[PDB]
């Protein structure tokens, strides 16, 4: 259960629609048909390792969220969805963590026929302003650096790189 008002219709570079919605406990054939348009290469620069197929364990985390700590929405044409984008609060030492904890983590998956049309951009517009209305003050987001597209989207959201401490990954973040 989330606020009507999360749901919104965006309008793409091309002038072409989608609707942005919370996914639902309803969404797991649409997740996973999703899932199969979308390529090898983003998938491992989502998840850090391949993952052609995931897992029952991340379609049901992908798919059930309390709507306040953890939010996934989806963004749609026609019904199927070609995006998804999400938070999860996380605590000081990087676990999932619960308000007054107000860091949280940011992550996305768009397919690749999708890609060119502004669809990361109003995803990430759209997550901020919910996680506003549950209190986050900041997300991080992470980032392979072999993706460089994808710091760009984030950059050009309004994100700064930062020391990450760990090999391997870009930190990018973003004060809401």
């Not at 996380?90 to 502004?118: K, N």
Request: aromatic share 10%; proline share 4%.
């Amino acid at each position: 259960e989330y606020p009507a008002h999360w749901e919104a219709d965006v309008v793409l570079r091309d002038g072409g629609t989608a609707r942005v919605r919370p996914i639902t406990v309803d969404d797991a054939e649409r997740l996973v048909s999703f899932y199969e348009q979308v390529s090898d290469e983003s998938k491992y620069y989502r998840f850090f390792a391949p993952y052609p197929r995931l897992s029952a364990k991340d379609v049901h985390r992908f798919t059930h969220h309390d709507f306040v700590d953890r939010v996934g929405l989806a963004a749609t044409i026609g019904g199927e969805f070609i995006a998804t984008v999400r938070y999860d609060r996380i605590g000081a030492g990087g676990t999932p963590a619960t308000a007054p904890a107000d860091e949280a983590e940011v992550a996305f998956l768009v397919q690749d026929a999708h890609q060119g049309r502004g669809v990361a951009s109003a995803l990430l517009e759209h997550i901020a302003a919910v996680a506003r209305e549950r209190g986050i003050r900041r997300f991080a987001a992470e980032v392979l650096p072999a993706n460089n597209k994808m710091i760009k989207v984030f950059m050009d959201a309004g994100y700064t790189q930062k020391r990450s401490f760990e090999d391997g990954v870009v930190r990018l973040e973003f004060d809401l």
